[PDB]
């Protein structure tokens, strides 16, 4: 699932990169993939 | 009632059972003085059922036998009326498959009969030697052995004379005879003071009508021989003849044990007896060489081993007399099929080889290399291997050696199990053929190569192995075409992808390069090693083990048929062998980093090691820190110390700790040549002993330990004093690793700095209010005391004497 730390790393990544570059945001996250990133954000 | 009370207060066996060792001291001492008054009258009836209680434990037994022995020493007389009871309730323990039941019953009965009233024993256990039950006769007989241990045979020997001269019962004559054999088992050497008295005891029954007594007396002869090593028939001649005649005029169980005894005396014998006796018994043996029976086979073959293994059994004698029926009836499939016969047939046949040579035995077991029960030819090579390995192959003539080499080839092809059996057989056989093997190297290799071509991995791997065995003789017979063959053809197979074969190929190449040096290798290592570098990425323990072995050899000795750039790439590949799951690989990797630092200079390899320290995950960080230590040890430490120290400034944890751990290993490895770099290193350890983290201080402490043990005796004690100032505060600590490395630093520092300095550090906190500090200082002072308790005699303070004690030492201040 998802933990405060990862959720905030996500928040930071997205707010920087923009809301359609899911693959790099996924790359920032250890053991998280772009499907899950996109779902969690939306 | 005072008796029930005395038992009440007597159950402080609870004080001894439960409790502090203080409890043990109070009760043990009080009872060891109260033993007479409290008596064993009540004790013994309280005492026997706990000693027999099913789960009184090891130390419960230990303590209660402590009790029984010391209270029986105390009460030599005040244990008197309970003797038969103790006796019969403990008796089965000496004859008991618990060695320690034997031991403990033995010891307490020693002390029991020892402080006992003497005649009592005889009185109770005369009428039981005549008894009807062999059970009770054996129990009381081995008891009597223990009682002779307790007292001594002399006091008893005429009553033995009685129990053995009885004309009422054969039961009792058998009983006395086994008492004899039993002491002969127990006291061993201790019999020669009698040495014939027991022989006299026994002369009556080897002629007796009851086979039981007759044959247990034969075994008594056996046991007495055993404890009565080579000192021969200056005692035993008095019975040699009934043995002699019953051997033939008997059949069965008597044949067994009587043969056993006579073969136990056959060592102790002499020519004019050990020629007639052996020569006579040999015809018995020839009729028994067809005996189906198992313990028969055991006894007769053991006999034969000693018997036809003396100096008075002629070479000719055996070769024409024993061998034909021996080989005929034991070299059938049955014996190798058997679990016992395999090994024991081995034993005696290797001994007969030791006797009469190889050019007949080898010839008699050649073609058993081509039989059916693979177990069989397995056995025959087991033997042959043992044989020629102990003896040498001097007398093996032409045709013999031929059929041998050929049966060898067969065994090895025919192989159907993964065993070192046939490998070792081959290795030994050519190891002994030495230079005899020249003309079959086409044959031997051609075989091995056709196997190397096979479809299934296993046989391929086998042929690689066999090459790695015979590798040395391959050359030593000057195999230009042939050892050249194996060189280039294995350079071919270096492309395999079955790890199990690739590893063995690497092994065989290594075992060729060992014999033939680098600069005449058939593939020049100038092309070998470039081929090897892409294999170091094979992520498999066996191929990785053997590859790093081969590259380590080359980088050690070859090292110059390769270019700096090659060595650099190979460095970069080694950097990730440091994560193999097997530790042999990792130690080999570190060694080769050392060799490469020798061949190329140290500086580039050291740069590539620091960048690895930056990795995480610890077990490859720790192994690169070992490698740094090794590079520094080979190429002198001044080359690497500045770079290490300077890297101590990159602000990351794993790397500052890598630097500290590397200096740890470095001072361990160099040792007494730390008297140079101790000054350079101190301000970095004081830096890291003023906090940076737990692990920071744990590691700086380890470094202090090894510096101190290196610089023992070279005067750099001011520097270790300075670092004591910084290590000693960590004394109050909790984490196990941290406080443990601290304590280690203080033992090292104790030898290197002396025990005054450390007793002074430990003075004031011995008697402190607190208890955490009292305990740490008494832990230290204990370790300072154990080692070097004898210096301190001149280091203790001056501790004034109050009123009713004297505490000053006037001995030490006599003037003179």
């Amino acid at each position: 699932v998802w933990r405060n730390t990862e959720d905030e790393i996500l928040k930071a990544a997205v707010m920087k990169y923009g809301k359609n570059q899911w693959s790099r945001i996924a790359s920032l996250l250890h053991r998280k993939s772009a499907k899950q990133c996109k779902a969690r954000w939306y | 009632p005072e008796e029930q009370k005395e038992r009440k207060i007597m159950k402080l066996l609870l004080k001894i059972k439960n409790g502090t060792p203080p409890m043990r001291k109070a009760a043990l001492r009080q009872i060891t003085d109260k033993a007479r008054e409290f008596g064993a009258g009540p004790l013994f009836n309280q005492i026997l059922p706990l000693l027999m209680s099913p789960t009184l434990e090891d130390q419960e037994r230990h303590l209660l036998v402590k009790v029984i022995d010391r209270i029986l020493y105390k009460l030599d007389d005040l244990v008197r009326p309970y003797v038969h009871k103790i006796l019969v309730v403990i008796e089965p323990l000496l004859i008991d498959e618990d060695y320690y039941a034997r031991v403990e019953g033995r010891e307490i009965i020693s002390n029991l009969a020892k402080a006992a009233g003497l005649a009592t024993m005889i009185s109770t256990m005369r009428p039981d030697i005549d008894n009807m039950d062999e059970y009770v006769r054996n129990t009381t007989a081995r008891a009597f052995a223990v009682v002779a241990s307790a007292l001594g045979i002399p006091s008893l020997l005429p009553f033995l004379k009685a129990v053995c001269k009885s004309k009422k019962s054969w039961q009792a004559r058998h009983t006395g005879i086994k008492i004899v054999q039993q002491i002969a088992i127990l006291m061993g050497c201790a019999i020669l003071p009698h040495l014939r008295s027991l022989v006299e005891i026994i002369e009556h029954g080897l002629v007796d009508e009851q086979q039981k007594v007759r044959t247990i007396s034969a075994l008594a002869i056996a046991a007495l021989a055993e404890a009565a090593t080579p000192y021969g028939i200056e005692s035993f001649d008095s019975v040699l003849k009934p043995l002699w005649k019953g051997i033939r005029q008997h059949r069965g169980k008597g044949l067994a044990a009587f043969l056993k005894a006579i073969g136990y005396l056959i060592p102790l014998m002499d020519a004019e007896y050990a020629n007639y006796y052996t020569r006579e018994v040999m015809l018995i043996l020839i009729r028994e060489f067809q005996s189906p029976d198992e313990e028969m086979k055991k006894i007769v073959l053991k006999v034969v081993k000693q018997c036809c293994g003396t100096d008075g059994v002629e070479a000719n004698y055996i070769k024409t007399e024993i061998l034909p029926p021996f080989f005929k009836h034991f070299w059938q499939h049955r014996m190798a099929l058997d679990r016992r016969n395999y090994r024991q047939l081995v034993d005696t046949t290797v001994e007969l080889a030791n006797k009469v040579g190889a050019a007949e035995i080898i010839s008699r077991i050649v073609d058993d290399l081509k039989d059916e029960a693979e177990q069989y030819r397995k056995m025959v090579m087991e033997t042959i291997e043992k044989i020629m390995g102990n003896l040498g192959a001097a007398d093996i003539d032409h045709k013999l050696e031929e059929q041998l080499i050929d049966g060898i080839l067969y065994a090895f092809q025919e192989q159907t199990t993964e065993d070192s059996v046939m490998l070792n057989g081959f290795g030994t056989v050519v190891n002994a053929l030495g230079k005899r093997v020249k003309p079959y190297l086409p044959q031997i290799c051609g075989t091995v190569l056709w196997r190397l071509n096979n479809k299934s991995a296993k046989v391929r791997q086998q042929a690689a192995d066999l090459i790695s065995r015979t590798a040395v003789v391959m050359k030593t017979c000057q195999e230009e075409k042939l050892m050249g063959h194996l060189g280039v053809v294995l350079y071919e197979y270096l492309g395999e992808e079955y790890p199990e074969v690739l590893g063995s190929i690497l092994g065989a190449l290594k075992a060729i390069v060992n014999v033939i040096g680098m600069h005449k290798m058939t593939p020049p290592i100038k092309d070998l090693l470039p081929r090897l570098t892409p294999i170091l990425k094979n992520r498999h323990e066996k191929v990785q083990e053997n590859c790093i072995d081969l590259v380590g050899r080359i980088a050690d000795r070859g090292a110059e048929y390769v270019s700096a750039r090659e060595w650099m790439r190979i460095c970069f590949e080694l950097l990730e062998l440091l994560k193999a799951h097997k530790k042999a690989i990792r130690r080999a990797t570190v060694n080769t980093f050392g060799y490469i630092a020798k061949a190329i200079g140290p500086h580039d390899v050291l740069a590539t090691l620091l960048n690895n320290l930056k990795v995480q995950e610890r077990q490859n960080r720790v192994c690169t820190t070992v490698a740094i230590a090794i590079v520094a040890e080979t190429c002198s430490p001044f080359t690497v110390l500045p770079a290490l120290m300077n890297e101590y400034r990159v602000p990351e944890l794993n790397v500052q700790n890598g630097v500290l751990k590397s200096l740890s290993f470095l001072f361990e490895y160099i040792g007494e040549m730390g008297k140079d770099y101790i000054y350079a290193v101190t301000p970095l350890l004081e830096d890291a002993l003023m906090d940076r983290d737990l692990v920071h201080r744990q590691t700086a402490s380890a470094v202090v330990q090894h510096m101190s043990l290196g610089v023992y005796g070279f005067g750099c004690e001011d520097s270790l004093n300075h670092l004591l100032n910084y290590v000693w505060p960590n004394v109050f600590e909790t984490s196990p690793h941290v406080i443990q490395a601290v304590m280690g630093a203080l033992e090292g520092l104790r030898v290197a700095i002396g025990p005054c300095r450390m007793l002074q550090y430990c003075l004031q906190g011995l008697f402190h209010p607190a208890r955490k500090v009292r305990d740490v200082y008494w832990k230290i002072y204990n370790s300072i005391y154990i080692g070097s308790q004898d210096a301190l005699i001149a280091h203790y303070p001056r501790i004034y004497n109050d009123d009713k004690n004297t505490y000053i030492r006037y001995e030490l201040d006599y003037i003179l």
Binding site: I9, K16, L28 | -
Partner: protein, 45 residues
Amino acid sequence: GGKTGSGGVASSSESNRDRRERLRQLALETIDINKDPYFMKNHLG
């Protein structure tokens, strides 16, 4: 179609080290864009 003159592909340990470092720069960026006076990076990282 790959290309000639290239190394391999970074191994998981190096990929991990640089994932870490990139994460750290992500952190420095966010604490920059959020202007924090309550922050320190210590001599141990």
